[PDB]
Symmetry: D3
Subunit: 29 residues, 6 copies
Amino acid sequence: ELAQAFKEIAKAFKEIAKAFEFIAQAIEK
Amino acid sequence: ELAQAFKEIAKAFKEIAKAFEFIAQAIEK
Amino acid sequence: ELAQAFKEIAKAFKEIAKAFEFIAQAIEK
Amino acid sequence: ELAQAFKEIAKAFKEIAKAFEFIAQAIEK
Amino acid sequence: ELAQAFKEIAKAFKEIAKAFEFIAQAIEK
Amino acid sequence: ELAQAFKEIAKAFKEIAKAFEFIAQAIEK
Ligand SMILES: [Cl-]
Ligand SMILES: [Cl-]
């Protein structure tokens, strides 16, 4: 029960990291 | 371009909040 | 003990989501 | 406008860090 | 200036994702 | 095992808070 929840959390933070990379790329461009 | 990225980020943090509420409920139970 | 801490964490991430929505709205405007 | 929003975000993440330290201390104890 | 900061942020969230995966693995085990 | 992981997480969120303060300062300037 707890394991999957923390896995869903790790996945959400990876999507967040992706979004901030995107943002970084939009600024440079 | 930037607006939607930050919106996608706000959505990810809301899913994260949901997950930690879930976790909180799993502990109590 | 642990439950409330994770609840305080879920609340903080919801405030964070709100802030990024705000930011998104400030960019568009 | 944007500056204060990111400041409110930095403050929220510091409260989050505090909460996870708390959690870490509750586990050890 | 801003680009690198958001890149440093994306990197921090990836380390966070790693940590929660670790945690998930510690629970199962 | 779990304690140190959550400590590493609290440290990552403090670095994140620092980065958003930086960003806030870059906007004002
Ligand atoms: Cl736990
Ligand atoms: Cl910006």
